[PDB]
Copies of this chain bind each other. A is one copy, B any other.
Amino acid sequence: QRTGIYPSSDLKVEDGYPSSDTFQIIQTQDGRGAGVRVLKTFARGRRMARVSGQITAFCRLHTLQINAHTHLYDPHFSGLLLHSCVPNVRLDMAGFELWSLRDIAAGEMLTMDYASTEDVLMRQFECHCGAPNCRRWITGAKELPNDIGQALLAGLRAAAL
């Protein structure tokens, strides 16, 4: 009865896979590209969706890291989750489920800490999450800012005097 974000028929909304009546991909207007938006309210501590995708050996812009050498290619859903330094969802890559870390109001962008699942990103980027504590430049957890990132961080540091 409910229509799923994932195109595969075997992934059913009645089993927890995301529905287009609950999640929507939209183009942000603040330089973050496209991202997942929630259309209903979620209390903190609830499973918002089961997650799926295709196994691949290679890190890509729309993969998530499963373990040391294996990634999950999901350009329909979890790969379109935007980053925030203060995230409102956790993507559990062992149970393959998305959970609310806080109360999320309908219409809010869904955000994970990319460094919470990823050793290294496909690309580093300057962060537009707006949080009071923005790392400003976003990497994997096991990844040093590259020389562009170090230069931008230094200009911000001088400004901090």
Contacts and interface: CB of A to CB of B under 8 A. Distances in A.
A2 to B, nearest CB: 17
A155 to B, nearest CB: 15
Contact of A56 (B11, B68, B131, B135): B11
Contact of A96 (B16, B57, B99): B57
Oligomer copy total: 4
Contacts of A30: none
Q: How large is the interface on A (under 10, 10 to 19, 20 to 34, 35 or more residues)?
A: 35 or more
Contact of A15 (B58, B86, B95): B58
A90 B67 contact: no
B116 A90 contact: yes
A132 interface: yes
